Design a protein around this nucleic acid. Structure first.
Lengths: 216, 109, 128, 124, 225, 4
RNA sequence: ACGCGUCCCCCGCGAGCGCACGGGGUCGGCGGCGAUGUCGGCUACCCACCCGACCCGUCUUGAAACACGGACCAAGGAGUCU
RNA sequence: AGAGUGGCGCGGACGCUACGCCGCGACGAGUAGGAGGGCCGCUGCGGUGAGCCUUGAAGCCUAGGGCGCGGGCCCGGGUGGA
């Protein structure tokens, strides 16, 4: 025994290492670390005691059946996938929700969960939008970034706690999660020159006013 | 309190003078007039919206007239503003010179 | 309670319609059934751009989906209760069809048997 | 041999049924019921069969005696097995394996003596 | 029985592996030695021309060994001498190509088909992309792919062309088993040109495409493969 | 033998 | 290029865990809408619009031809024995 | 994957109508005319199906449901009456 060390070549590009395999002979201390060369159970019963077996054979076979698959190369499930982002999205920037019962609304970003969804948080007060998830792809990012360095963002509000149950009702658990996550946010939006007439109002298209041209 | 899609007009099938292809359309997106301009629109969802005699059920509403064909913008076409498309349901030619909506959602901003 | 098959893939096909015979669309004396045009003059023999088309073998059904009905089985036609027993070990791919001209009373005795034996019958309720 | 008379039967017997691109066989002791050279039920010198018992209850099994292959009223030999579904199948696997009596059929006679009981059991 | 035989069955497996690790290092040391050639031959053609231009001389560079050829006219209506000469180069369909070594018997074949082809003198990049991406074989009267180094070592072998590295040397330098290692290859499978043709009917020199190009065949390859 |  | 026992010019079975651009795809990922008015149904009946499409047999170097037989439907109707 | 003389647990998918299955490549216009294969049709004779039918045979009709590239064939309904 002798605890497990970290890898001794820094990663240069995916697949490729850094230090070549005679010079890397050095670093795994190769030269100086040479070497050379369940079934059944027996319980008591009321002279005799039985021999029981764990996993006995089945009592119905089926008449026809499928055969085993060829193993795929490198196919992990969702849980183990790798999560990304975009450049414009950073913590505290301004997001435009574009799809649900809230659509066109100006909504603030807080923290990307480990399911990969966002946390698009309206300050329930102003818009009418609470703690919620939305999905990278259906959310435009915007150039405005009031900072969210110094406040507090809770842990227990993790991605399963949101996941659905079954007149769903707002219990007394999601009311100190509601006003305490947002009253740390609320002293930094009103302090900017005239920003709480804009998160409340809705954006939309008119004419002369084309998606492909303008910056937002 | 307003619109959330961009207006455009189905303007024939993909084709050359004497044989027409029906699995690709040809949209004229509004106010977009070169190639340069048409990166935005690529991949982005699109809709032909219409209205039969009987009731179709919906998601998020009551069972009423209104239905859709759904699709997809694929690549640019020509020199001048135009764009190709690929709906799941092959379009009517009634709709030639009538409205279709390109959306904003699968955005890359 | 319907019977699942063993396995149910994606049926995909190449045409849909029949192949109709040339000029069945003018002379009622000409039957739908297909015939190879053996003309001189002819258009359909020579494949001009417009007309009818011709059967080829590039209109193949694929071996993993040929004789497979929608439910997913393939037919095997029957007359009495002894010819049923045949299928029993191969339930999950094949499905009995009690024959047309088989009677009303002998038809009742069958559908009982293809219950005890899990075999799927395409024309159960019938003569009544 | 067996190998001879197949060449004779293969495509001709009064036990042959064709149609709808399929092909079957209604011979006493064919268990899989298909015209084949494993599975025919008369040809050979040794035979296994699994028939649904007398009344409702049970299953009946059929060996072919090695001796008198020319004496048919004393050629096959019979026994009934009317016990629990996992335990009944102790017998049948202890007939094919430990006699060395024709070791191809093993996994046919386990799927035929388990869809003769899944019958006589009462229906859905 | 066995306890002996199983240990002797754990001595033959480590032998067939050791047949690979003595061969696995040789694929590296064959490739690192051809890299020495492709700076020692590359800079020895810039060596002579400076040191001539120095003393008011001239230096004519080495006239070619090797040339790629591509068939650009179709398959309909064709004169009976040309069908025979295009056959012999294995160009049997449009947009197909081949390696061809040069001499007098090899050029005067290429003046009889000189309005059905385009040819030129290829480079270290237009030899390898073709042999890497496209290049198939001809083993057991079949066009079976090369995703291995026991197909080229296994058919030819006796000529000493084992890995993917020696098919670059023996062709890009026309060496002393070239014939077999070029009738080894099935002819190439280029799709059409992405950009296009200038004018297919006519000779390069007039405007279009046909006939030889000495140093701009490199433009109809990275467009076509 | 040479590496042990 | 990296134990050692001898041949030299030239001065033959170590121990295990682990990640992957590696011999053709899988989520140990999600959401709506459900009983007399809606779900599905390529196939077969009617309509509508865009592209294409001259009438068949035939002799003939050449037939949509200002070349000939054909108003419609049934039932018969032509390489055969010795 | 050679053979010798001396120094606890009775267990492990499918197959192979060999006239069948499976395995890796290149190609696929056709009139006069050749050739193979047809679980494509129509009527009679020997064998066979412990075939089927007055609890409804053949024939017809059918905006009913299924099958094969194709020739053609399987099932729902109504008539009909051996």
């Amino acid at each position: 025994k002798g605890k497990p060390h970290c890898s001794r070549n820094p990663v240069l590009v995916r697949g490729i290492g850094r230090y070549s395999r005679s010079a890397m002979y050095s670093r795994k201390a190769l030269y100086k670390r040479k070497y050379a060369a369940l079934a059944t159970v027996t319980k008591p019963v009321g002279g005799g005691t039985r021999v029981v077996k764990l996993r006995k054979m089945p009592r119905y076979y089926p008449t026809e059946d499928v055969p085993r698959k060829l193993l795929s190369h490198g196919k992990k499930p969702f849980s183990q996938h790798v999560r990304k982002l975009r450049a414009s999205i950073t913590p505290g920037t301004i997001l435009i929700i574009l799809t649900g019962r809230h659509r066109g609304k100006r909504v603030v970003f807080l923290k990307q969960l480990s399911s990969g969804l966002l946390l698009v948080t309206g300050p329930l007060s102003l818009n009418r939008v609470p703690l919620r998830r939305t999905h990278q792809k259906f959310v435009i990012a915007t150039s405005t970034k009031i900072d969210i360095s110094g406040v507090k963002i809770p842990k227990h509000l993790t991605d399963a706690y949101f996941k659905k149950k079954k007149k769903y009702e707002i219990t007394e658990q999601r009311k100190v999660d509601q006003k305490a996550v947002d009253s740390q946010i609320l002293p930094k939006i009103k302090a900017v020159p005239q920003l709480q007439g804009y998160l409340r109002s809705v954006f939309a298209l008119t004419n002369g006013v084309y998606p492909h041209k303008l910056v937002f | 309190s307003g619109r959330l899609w961009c207006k455009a007009i189905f303007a024939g099938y993909k084709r050359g003078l004497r044989n027409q292809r029906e699995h690709t359309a040809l949209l004229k997106i509004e106010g977009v007039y070169a190639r340069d301009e048409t990166e935005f629109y690529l991949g982005k969802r699109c809709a032909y919206v219409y209205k039969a005699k009987n009731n179709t059920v919906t998601p998020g509403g009551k069972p009423n007239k209104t239905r859709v064909i759904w699709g997809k913008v694929t690549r640019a076409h020509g020199n001048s503003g135009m764009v190709r498309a690929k709906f799941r349901s092959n379009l009517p030619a009634k709709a030639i010179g009538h409205r279709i909506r390109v959306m904003l959602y699968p955005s890359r901003i | 309670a319907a019977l699942r098959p063993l396995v149910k893939p994606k049926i995909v096909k190449k045409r849909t319609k029949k192949f109709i015979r040339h000029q069945s669309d003018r002379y009622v004396k000409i039957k739908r059934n297909w015939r190879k045009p053996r003309g001189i003059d002819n258009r359909v023999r020579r494949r001009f751009k417009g007309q009818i088309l011709m059967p080829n073998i590039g209109y193949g059904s694929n071996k993993k989906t040929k004789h497979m009905l929608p439910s997913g089985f393939r037919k095997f036609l029957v007359h009495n209760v002894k010819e049923l027993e045949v299928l029993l070990m191969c339930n999950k791919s094949y499905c009995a069809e009690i024959a047309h001209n088989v009677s009303s009373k002998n038809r009742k005795a069958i559908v009982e048997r293809a219950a005890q034996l899990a075999i799927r019958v395409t024309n159960p309720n019938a003569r009544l | 041999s067996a190998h001879l008379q197949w060449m004779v039967v293969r495509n001709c017997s009064s036990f042959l049924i064709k149609r709808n691109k399929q092909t079957y066989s209604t011979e006493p002791n064919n268990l899989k019921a298909r015209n084949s050279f494993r599975y025919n039920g008369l040809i050979h010198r040794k035979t296994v069969g699994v028939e649904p018992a007398a009344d409702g209850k049970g299953v009946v099994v059929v060996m072919k005696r090695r001796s008198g292959q020319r004496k048919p009223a004393t050629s096959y030999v019979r026994t009934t097995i009317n016990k629990n579904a996992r335990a009944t199948l102790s017998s049948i696997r202890h007939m094919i394996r430990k006699n060395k009596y024709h070791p191809d059929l093993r996994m046919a006679a386990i799927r035929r003596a388990s869809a003769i009981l899944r019958s006589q059991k009462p229906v859905m | 029985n066995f306890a002996e035989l199983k240990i002797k069955r754990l001595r033959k497996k480590f032998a067939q592996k050791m047949l690979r690790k003595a061969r696995r290092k040789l694929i590296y040391e064959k490739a690192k030695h051809y890299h020495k050639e492709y700076r020692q031959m590359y800079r020895t053609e810039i060596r002579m021309a400076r040191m001539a231009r120095k003393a008011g001389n001239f230096y004519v560079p080495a006239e070619p060994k090797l040339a790629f050829v591509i068939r650009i006219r179709g398959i309909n209506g064709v004169s009976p001498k040309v069908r025979k000469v295009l056959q012999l180069l294995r160009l049997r369909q449009i947009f197909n190509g081949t390696f061809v070594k040069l001499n007098k018997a090899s050029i005067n074949m290429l003046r009889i088909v000189e309005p059905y082809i385009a040819w030129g003198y290829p480079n270290l990049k237009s030899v390898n992309e073709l042999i890497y991406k496209r290049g198939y074989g001809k083993i057991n009267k079949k066009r079976i792919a090369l995703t291995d180094n026991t197909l080229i070592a296994r058919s030819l072998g006796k000529y000493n062309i084992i890995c993917m590295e020696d098919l670059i040397h023996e062709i890009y330098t026309v060496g002393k088993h070239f014939k077999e290692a070029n009738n080894f290859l099935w002819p190439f499978k280029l799709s059409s040109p992405r950009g296009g043709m200038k004018k297919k009917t006519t000779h390069f020199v007039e405007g279009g495409d046909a006939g030889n190009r000495e140093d701009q065949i490199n433009r109809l390859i990275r467009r076509m493969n | 033998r040479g590496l042990r």
